[PDB]
Design a protein around this ligand. Sequence first.
Ligand code: HEM
Ligand code: HEM
Ligand code: HEM
Ligand code: HEM
Lengths: 141, 141, 145, 145
Amino acid sequence: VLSPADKTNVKAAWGKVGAHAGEYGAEALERMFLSFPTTKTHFPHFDLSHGSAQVKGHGKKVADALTNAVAHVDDMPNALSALSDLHAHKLRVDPVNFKLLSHCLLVTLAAHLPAEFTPAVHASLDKFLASVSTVLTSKYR
Amino acid sequence: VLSPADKTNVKAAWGKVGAHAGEYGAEALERMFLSFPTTKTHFPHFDLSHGSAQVKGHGKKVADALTNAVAHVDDMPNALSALSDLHAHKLRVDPVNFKLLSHCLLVTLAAHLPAEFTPAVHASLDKFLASVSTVLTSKYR
Amino acid sequence: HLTPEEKSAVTALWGKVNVDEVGGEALGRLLVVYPWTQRFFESFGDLSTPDAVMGNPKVKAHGKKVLGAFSDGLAHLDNLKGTFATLSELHCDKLHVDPENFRLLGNVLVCVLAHHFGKEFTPPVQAAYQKVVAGVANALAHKYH
Amino acid sequence: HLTPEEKSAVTALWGKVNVDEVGGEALGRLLVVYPWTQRFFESFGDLSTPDAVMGNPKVKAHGKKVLGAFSDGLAHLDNLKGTFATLSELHCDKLHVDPENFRLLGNVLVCVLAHHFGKEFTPPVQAAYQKVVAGVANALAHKYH
Ligand code: HEM
Ligand code: HEM
Ligand code: HEM
Ligand code: HEM
């Protein structure tokens, strides 16, 4: 479960991200695609090259969803319910891929938060992204 | 999440286990130790030879906990509270190992309950073991 | 790697398998137990219930195709990557199947063999089949890029 | 298989890494982020808070040794199983270390490199490092039995 300190840490870090969240979302997907090539199987309709507008557009959506989750950190299942449905019943991405994107999101944050990404903040963000992931796969079966 | 049909399925199948729960727990552990030998790092103190009293005894502990969990399927976190504490605070089982023992328990049940292991019951059992696993790792951080 | 005894154990049990039956069953169970795997089979018709999935003739047909290829691969246990390379390329390049699905199918297959053979599917036999399904899954994911 | 470009990327970035400091940072972060891994370091003293873990002399010393071995492995990217065999056996037989921790440390190390280097740890550099930490973890788990 996310503690009060975890929530504080997530809000501070995401708050520093601020307006760059969409850019960071796309960077994290780029990071994922290159680092873990099997994740590209869910995007055969995308141009996955660097700078693709498709990745950027999807990065903005992912980031906006994360912003939404941060904003409703005590009520994540309902905030992400439409996304849990979509992933469970339409996209059907294997649950294992969420850990790969969560690591890349973490890496993206680390590369952009020199001051903020302390060990404790890293720990909270890892927990938060795992919790988001759990919510997103909660309706798979 | 465990649906009501899932709970019905688990209670029926696990009730059929009955007095064999201890023997099945031990067999599941032996199946795990031979199939996934890295799991043995958690039991260096044990005589892991086939038929060992220690494995039989630990198998009964594991099975009785599963019996407890099935019995209190609507409130697993509470019912397994001391065990989730123990695993989180005293042991050092990476969460990956829970999938491995869960798969070995399914194999065990499949091998011993021909009539009860239908596709639907298999799905229910898998979900239940995943849920137990989630409860047991819930206090890790 | 499988030991000589493990190879023999795999070969002996597989000689008793009805590949089309076990294939239909393992694929159906994959679709029931891990329902997101139904995403590749939207053209297969009714998949609405466990009974419909299991009884779906297209699911059954696909299962025999998949397990027939698995079956044929058991003759090339020391060349699984070579044996499955072209199928790996196809699954990645044209079918876009996430290789985790190979691991999931492998685990369902083991559960089906356990169900089917009961006590004959002993711990050692299972251990041997785990190496096989891991090896096949790794071979099918090997050419992904 | 690291490409040539991937090997160059790994090497160029590693010339800027202070192995002792990064080792200490990465092991400390592993113990803070996945605190059950503290169970493998029972005699290391105070691990009570994040600051205590990061500042612990034993953690810093151990991290220097662990990353020093990782560093030496980077000279043998084509033979990681052979380069880490002795340490794999040690980690299994004497240390009883759950091998998933090799993967976790690899990922924490990638996060430290991203934090420390910022923008120069590009997506392509990261991908090269992911193949390396996957290879090292596989190599360290290879002799488990
Ligand atoms: C933090 C974890 C994730 C979040 C917050 C997230 C969020 C989203 C959002 C907000 C959308 C767009 C929904 C819409 O268009 O209505 C989406 C679509 C999608 N997601 Fe997820 N996602 C996550 C993880 C993943 C992962 C790990 C994968 C696969 C590797 C994935 C694959 C997809 C795909 C393929 C689409 C459809 C994209 C398109 O065709 O435009 N997602 N996701
Ligand atoms: C279905 C999942 C599991 C259940 C229900 C379970 C249950 C238990 C129980 C009931 C105990 C005994 C505590 C006592 O004596 O009061 C125990 C201990 C233990 N478990 Fe878990 N466990 C599970 C998964 C695992 C896994 C996957 C591992 C490692 C591979 C593991 C490693 C251990 C160890 C090392 C001990 C202590 C044994 C001893 O020294 O006697 N457990 N578990
Ligand atoms: C043991 C692992 C597997 C083996 C050996 C295997 C083998 C095959 C073979 C031989 C084909 C036909 C190739 C052709 O048309 O030239 C095929 C097609 C296909 N496979 Fe795989 N498969 C495996 C696992 C899976 C899994 C787990 C899935 C999805 C959950 C999958 C999805 C598909 C799909 C969608 C097709 C195309 C079928 C069609 O167009 O009717 N396969 N597979
Ligand atoms: C990059 C992967 C790793 C490498 C290359 C590595 C390397 C080493 C080396 C070289 C030593 C012996 C140091 C000496 O000469 O004194 C050692 C010891 C040890 N390592 Fe690993 N290690 C790795 C990961 C881990 C992880 C992830 C854990 C646990 C979570 C771990 C647990 C230990 C322990 C407990 C010892 C013995 C420490 C003591 O003496 O108390 N190692 N490792």
